[PDB]
């Protein structure tokens, strides 16, 4: 079935490899192995890195990949890196927002600091690309 | 007739559709690229040209003509809780095509009032200004709770 | 010497009628490209400079100008009844007969008489393909009254 | 004499004119490209260089010098219902050359007042700012 | 009485009617100024008085084959002298030459540029900075500013 | 004798070499040696230098590298070059900010000067790329006792 | 009248330019300067671009050495033939080093009376004064000049 | 460990000796070929170092500038520095002494310094650190004149 609370931030190369198999991306196992992609790097993967460093030339294939990564990010356990439980805060707003947890905690944001965050920061620093999402997160952050 | 549940389509249903619209030539590319319903609905000019090998702008226009038809008469119920499809359709039947674009950003009826022109263009993929403006206008004259 | 039929239902034209028109206007040389690219009425009415150069192989700007001269004539005298419920054709024509050529551009965006008042300059240029500023300005002005 | 009806010229008359002005070398290109009166009047720098193969900027300048003459002394009556030709000419004989530019956008005397500087440049092909400004000024005060 | 125009250095004739010059007179002038090397190019391209007066950096480099910026500068130095002392009577009905000359003798060189756009004394008051640069080919800002200033302070009533 | 926090500013080529081995970047030992990277240069290393001069072509590899370097920078002993103890000031704000110490002291900033620092300075001169971090550091700097 | 102290560079011919190149250790470039027909006027107006592309001086360092010599020459040159209003002494009074800008200003037809109206853009683009510090000083002093 | 070296007056030979002392003998040939003397050494840019002197590595350039900054910090500028800007800059911060030649080359002195802008200190005088620019500017506005 579908894995329950995987601790992706603490994943090692081997766990990333397993996940690539499960989602039907075995073709890319070699690249990910050579590049030594662990949990931290997987969560922070960009379009650019995927295309140039991991050899995923097709925009459609990349879209499929990010579709899977988004799913993983949505259901991951962030407890090692998420002391204030931003995951649950984001999830309460909309389950789909949970995917942004690692982006926020990687900049050192927590519940208490969230109120002061700017739109630019959510886009550039936290990697929230959808305006709709940014706006909703911003709004809710100002009112808690 | 029956409206196809394109959001839930798999590669095989996409392959069938390509045949029906006279694009059998492209079946192999779509198979290789593993285009399912979700990816079909979200297909861009760029992806069509570069990743699927549809070099001609005219051919791409023909393709989008067919895709727009499909999108107009698709069943979105699995992914469209608030029934944005009918809201769009009531404005103009041709706007139903934008359903998946809106629900893919997590918009629904309640959130629609707050949407910006930039958001409709960049996030939702509504390319025609005329359409954007009409959708924006009608969204502001909704229920604001 | 005007191509026959006059007052044609270009929106409903198929490849064959496009082919016939190309012959009549002395562009037989391009029949093959139009055939290969499967240009019908709808696509002919929406044809761009870019598509004409790249996809249909009309390399000369002067040849493209000759082509658009003919296409403008066709668009000016075409029957748009199937696709133009609000009769934008007559509205445009009343302003200036030459403006009737913009009918398909306006109806293809889903504009009609009632919506026209709200249209912007950007919309007329980008969405409706009205390239001449003079024309855009006149159409815009008249739209803001109705 | 009588001014030639350049708007109605066919390929053959364009060919004749090229010979007369000493541009015989370009007859073949003009023939291949099927340049008639309408296209001759609307010819751009770009078309002349790329489509007609006139590589030299100096040669193009010589060509436009001849074309401007032709435009200045052409008969526009078929296409110029409101006689913009005479209006332009009265301002400055040299402005008659812009007749076809204006009538091709569907302008006439009555509409002229509403024209903008951008429109005269982009739509009508009036490249000299000085000329644009004078035509604009006079158009607003006939209103 | 600083008249070096009666000097041996200065190309003959003095006060030439350059607007009416034909290829042959252009050829003669090239010889006098030590640009014989370019005679062939100018002949081939059929440069007459009107084209000589209107010549641009671009035409000089690409169409006439003068690849060096320094050589072009030398050329324009000579052309500016010619333009400064030329007779513009055929083309300058309102005597813009004298108007420009009264401001500064070296501004007379702009005469053909101004009359070529259809400027005259009466119209000069309305001229813009853009027009002097793009239409008249006055490249030096200092010159543009002085001409502009003087034009705005003209009596048109 | 072994110190807890390493004195990276005083490191020589040999200590840099050792560190590369420990973090699994032995592959790059040669490049670092040829380029004569010491502690000072290691602390000041940029993306560009890492790619072009040290031959680390992969953006993923560079990310792994900087992940290790950030840790080193966070826990380094800066006492030789940090007379006013900006390290502890930054650390008090957030332990993760200690990584910016060498950036600040390399421009000649100290506690007394910190109040005057601008956003542009923190970005261009000090190399603080994260907006969130800049803003927090800036805020705290303005509200200091001069 | 045989040897002058301050050289009349504006009136120099090719031959005097050639001699100067030899003296400053740039004999290697004599042929290029000869071929390009560089006289005093052109020497004084030489740009970075012309020096690199037309005269073949590829190195930025070599160009810097060249301009170091040219700046000296420009600073001490006699401009009397072309400088009626004595802008040279005006510039010199501000700072001796600013005398090097004389030919740049007189070549645009500036003089003392016109100086008050000059703009920063003009000093940079038309007169070739590249150092902002120099432009600012010249601009400041020019604001206290009397115009007509 | 040179005491007050008169770098502005240095000839090719002294620059060569200096290169040897700092472990850059590899670059002696290029510096010789390009005829780098004291004046050119003090005014050297990243661009000239890369393109004209063949120092391809950014890291090597950084090492070089580290040495040059040291030399500039300890140099005797008396030939070119009549108002003793060197001591004024040094009194502010010993690390500012390195900017002496940049300032005096533009003809600046103690009395003029106040009129300089931040852009001028960057573009004309080659002061790359914003923090340094701002500190020099501030102190210049508050100084005692005659």
Numbering used by the authors:
A (entry chain F): 402 to 545
B (entry chain G): 404 to 548
C (entry chain H): 400 to 545
D (entry chain A): 404 to 546
E (entry chain B): 392 to 548
F (entry chain E): 402 to 547
G (entry chain C): 401 to 548
H (entry chain D): 403 to 548
Q: How did the manuscript describe this experimental structure?
A:
Subsequently, studies have demonstrated that SARM1 is also a key part of a highly conserved axonal death pathway that is activated by nerve injury. In this way, SARM1 activation is triggered by a decrease in the concentration of a cellular metabolite NAD+, rather than depending on the introduction of an activating factor.
For cryo-EM imaging, we generated a near-intact hSARM1 construct that lacks the N-terminal mitochondrial localization signal (26ERL…GPT724) and has a point mutation in the NADase catalytic site (E642Q). We first collected cryo-EM images of the purified hSARM1E642Q. 2D classification and 3D reconstruction revealed an octamer ring assembly with clearly visible inner ring, which is attributed to the tandem SAM domains. Only a minor fraction of the particles (~20%) shows the presence of a (partial) peripheral ring composed by the ARM and TIR domains. Exploring different buffers, pH and salt conditions, addition of various detergents, as well as variations in cryo-EM grid preparation (e.g. ice thickness) did not affect the visibility of the octamer peripheral ring considerably. As it became clear that the compact two-ring structure is inhibited for NADase activity, we considered whether the purified hSARM1, that was not subjected to GraFix and predominantly presents just the inner SAM ring in cryo-EM 2D averaging and 3D reconstruction, is active in vitro. Using a resazurin fluorescence assay modified for an in vitro application, we measured the rate of NAD+ consumption by hSARM1w.t. in a series of NAD+ concentrations and determined a Km of 28 ± 4 µM, with Vmax of 9 ± 0.3 µM/min and Kcat of 46.49 1/min. This demonstrates that the purified hSARM1 is mostly NADase active, even without NMN supplement, supporting the idea of a predominantly open conformation as seen in cryo-EM.
